[PDB]
């Protein structure tokens, strides 16, 4: 699974999900379904900032934590907006809203539950992904356009299809109901 890892994502998602996963004590090494599932989150928090207009969203996944919180209250400093009680994805320029998104391997509305209710915000704005192409977004707002979204389900599609065919899937599917 390690190596599936690196020869399926691009280098600096690597990157950014090694520092992540160092930072909180984790292995990628050992726990390498959180590592996959790091990668993942990572390339569609990139593929959804680069599916609007080109400068339409702060970034806020992927940087340093303290960093992040740095651009997060200048967000709120200067737009009112309120504060989110935890790191946000990106912020949408457009629509006023951070975002926070979701990607898993069990039901869109359990987990955009679980999401909702940690987070506490009728500001934030979610946006939950799966790997069987199902979405949910707050108020069915899907902020994207459909072909950007699509591009995304298909890529999360192929990941699982990816993992299938190495026998990864099943190990990786159980591994977030095990969490
Ligand atoms: O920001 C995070 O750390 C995070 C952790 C687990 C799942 C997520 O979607 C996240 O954005
Ligand atoms: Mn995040
Ligand atoms: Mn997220």
New binding site residues.
Partial sequence: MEDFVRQCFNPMIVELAEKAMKEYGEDPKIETNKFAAICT?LEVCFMYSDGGSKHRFEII?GRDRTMAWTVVNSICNTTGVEKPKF?P?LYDYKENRFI???VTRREVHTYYLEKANKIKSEETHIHIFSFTGEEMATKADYTLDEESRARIKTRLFTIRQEMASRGLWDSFRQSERAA
């Fill in positions: 989150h996944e790191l994805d926070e998104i979701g």
